């Protein structure tokens, strides 16, 4: 019964995002019948997320459109989470409430 | 002190290194070469060694397009270079070549 915490939150959110996509789509997409690209679809997920962090338009030449609309959906969600977190942290630092060594550098990188 | 002329050995080793490691890791590739830094390796890739770069004579259309654009946006080479599909240094040299041979 470990309890979510600041150390574990980013890891937690991405953990349950990988699970969210995995359960949803592999219970949603299927008929591969053997194993359908779970490792691979998730690698497409991390690839897309990096691409959006680098602001590089990400277009895979072949791909099923439900898979693509999938990735674009969840990626936009994680983008909304990350961005909102960034705004909020800059508000906290602006008011000078939080003194942390990491959140300042991270928050900087984000902006 | 590190700066200097590019060598066929350094350039081929740069080909192989870029092939193996990938485009986004420059510090790793600069580690193998001597007398060259990471910035220099990257800009040396994207400026010249990159196979997507077009090395050949300019057709008539490319000269029309280059001249027109250069009269449209004076002195901006990094904006024009992607539009004609050539390297900024290359289209520069070719432009001074067009004014040089034009008179």
């Amino acid at each position: 019964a470990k309890t979510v915490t600041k150390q574990r939150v980013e890891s937690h959110f991405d953990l349950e995002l990988r699970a969210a996509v995995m359960h949803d789509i592999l219970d949603m997409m299927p008929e591969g019948i053997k194993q359908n690209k779970a490792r691979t679809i998730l690698q497409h997920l991390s690839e897309a997320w990096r691409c959006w962090k680098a602001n590089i338009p990400w277009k895979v030449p072949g791909l099923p459109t439900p898979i693509e609309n999938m990735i674009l959906r969840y990626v936009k969600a994680k983008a909304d989470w990350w961005t909102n977190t960034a705004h909020y942290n800059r508000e906290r630092i602006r008011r000078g409430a939080t003194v942390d060594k990491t959140v300042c550098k991270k928050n900087l990188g984000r902006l | 002190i590190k700066g200097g002329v590019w060598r066929n050995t350094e350039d081929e080793i740069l080909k192989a290194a870029v092939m193996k490691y990938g485009k986004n890791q420059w510090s790793r590739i600069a580690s193998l070469l001597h007398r060259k830094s990471a910035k220099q390796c990257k800009a040396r890739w994207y400026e010249w060694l990159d196979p997507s770069i077009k090395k050949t004579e300019w057709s008539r259309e490319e000269e029309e397009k280059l001249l027109h654009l250069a009269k449209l946006m004076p002195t901006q080479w990094r904006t024009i270079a992607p539009i004609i599909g050539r390297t900024a240094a290359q289209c520069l040299e070719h432009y001074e070549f067009l004014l040089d041979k034009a008179a």
Binding site: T40, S46, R50, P64 | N24, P74, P82
Partner: peptide, 27 residues
Amino acid sequence: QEWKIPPCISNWKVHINENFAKLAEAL
């Protein structure tokens, strides 16, 4: 065949307006 998935081999792990002409020639 449709559900062939391109391997996600990882890489980690342009047009112009004609108004520029009117402006530049104007100046």
